[PDB]
Amino acid sequence: VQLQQSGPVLVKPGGSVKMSCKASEYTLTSYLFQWVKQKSGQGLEWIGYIYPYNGGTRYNEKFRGKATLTSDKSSNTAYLELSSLTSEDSAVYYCARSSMSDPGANWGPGTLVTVSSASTKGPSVFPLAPSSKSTSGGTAALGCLVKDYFPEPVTVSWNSGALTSGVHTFPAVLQSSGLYSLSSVVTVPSSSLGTQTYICNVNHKPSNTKVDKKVEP
Amino acid sequence: LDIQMTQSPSSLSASLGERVSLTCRASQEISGYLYWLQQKPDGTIKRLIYAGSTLDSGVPKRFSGSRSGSDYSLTISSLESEDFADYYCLQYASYPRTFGGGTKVEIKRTVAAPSVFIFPPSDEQLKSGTASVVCLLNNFYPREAKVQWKVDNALQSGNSQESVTEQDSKDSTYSLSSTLTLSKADYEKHKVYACEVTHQGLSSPVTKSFNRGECG
Ligand SMILES: C[C@H](O)c1ccccc1
Numbered sequence: 001v002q003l004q005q006s007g008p009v010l011v012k013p014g015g016s017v018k019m020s021c022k023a024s025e026y027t028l029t030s031y032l033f034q035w036v037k038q039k040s041g042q043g044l045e046w047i048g049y050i051y052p053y054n055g056g057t058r059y060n061e062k063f064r065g066k067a068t069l070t071s072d073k074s075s076n077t078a079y080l081e082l083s084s085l086t087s088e089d090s091a092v093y094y095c096a097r098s099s100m101s102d103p104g105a106n107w108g109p110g111t112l113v114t115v116s117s118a119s120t121k122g123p124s125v126f127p128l129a130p131s132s133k134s135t136s137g138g139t140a141a142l143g144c145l146v147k148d149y150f151p152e153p154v155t156v157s158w159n160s161g162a163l164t165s166g167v168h169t170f171p172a173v174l175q176s177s178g179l180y181s182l183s184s185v186v187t188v189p190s191s192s193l194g195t196q197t198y199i200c201n202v203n204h205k206p207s208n209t210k211v212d213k214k215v216e217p
Numbered sequence: 218l219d220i221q222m223t224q225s226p227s228s229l230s231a232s233l234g235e236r237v238s239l240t241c242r243a244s245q246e247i248s249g250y251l252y253w254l255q256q257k258p259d260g261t262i263k264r265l266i267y268a269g270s271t272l273d274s275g276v277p278k279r280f281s282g283s284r285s286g287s288d289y290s291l292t293i294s295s296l297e298s299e300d301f302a303d304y305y306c307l308q309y310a311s312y313p314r315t316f317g318g319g320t321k322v323e324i325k326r327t328v329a330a331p332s333v334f335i336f337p338p339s340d341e342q343l344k345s346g347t348a349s350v351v352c353l354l355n356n357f358y359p360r361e362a363k364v365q366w367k368v369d370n371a372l373q374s375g376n377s378q379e380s381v382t383e384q385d386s387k388d389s390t391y392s393l394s395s396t397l398t399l400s401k402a403d404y405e406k407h408k409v410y411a412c413e414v415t416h417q418g419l420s421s422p423v424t425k426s427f428n429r430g431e432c433g
Pocket of ligand 1: 034035036046096098103104252307308309314
């Protein structure tokens, strides 16, 4: 039940981008790959399909022939290339797989493409330390400020995924500098502060940055 | 002609436990080739129904789908907090595949006042020239809230930005961050940093503050 898609990519206007979709499990069954576009905070638009079995393809005419779908049936991998890019192509692209009698059974997680002239920049990660000023009665809030990066996205986990409850990772905000920033916070028991460590795990794949920041009271 | 899927309502607010139905009208005959998907705030999309009424095997029984002439419906028998999401229909009778405009399903719940927390800039950040002071409003409802900053009792303007999460999947609340950005020199020259919060859940504004001189 897992389709894998290539990572986020920054590309310049007038260039091109090629992303991939593949089933995670060795399969051998004949699937059809459907591709869908979603601009930030907007709806869904069908892009086209590729049937690796026979190379069949079809495209939404709205794309004006800018999209090309190909595949490597040897690895059961489908690829979507977009040409002559402009900022209207900044969007998350999704693939879904269909079988005989089983339409759109599985969806990939999407690939985030940003079309921009600006250079990638990795984030600085700063602690939001718990203190009396972030402690109720028994509950303390703490977090990490992930500042000054481009393009989106960053990912944030806590304690390598062991801490998920009470976590709020805010949507990124574009600063006047043209760089993004966000904070991820979590509430935990105050009594855990002297003994349980809290580390935010931040990844910014466009700049190949990975940082693990320990947040101390 | 391309098939138009007209989805309504585009936004639906509903109490927990409520039976809610979403409608998608096909502009041409799709013969039951109607698919409904759910998209969660983190971007995850999953299949709910296909062939108009067949429930995907991993979806809870409170979801069902039906057809009445050219009208297709997705109904949730009694709404749960985890159902907060955007729902879309899609026809697969013909190409191009076409989607409904979606329905954002919002959850009505009782008023909850926020817990308010404030965080001074880290010394690590100060070493780099800029200072960010963060005020967190956690787990509140409804969404309307006002946050004001005062630095040594003077109201700030223009130097803060807010970010708000989507409704929480477990308790249907929101959280909000207000970040005040100052140069390190401006931060060091002032002393009292206060975040002032107004929300329907609070009788009077709550102010959380710290004095740079004492840490947090
Ligand atoms: C079954 C239909 O062709 C579909 C499903 C998911 C995404 C795009 C198209």
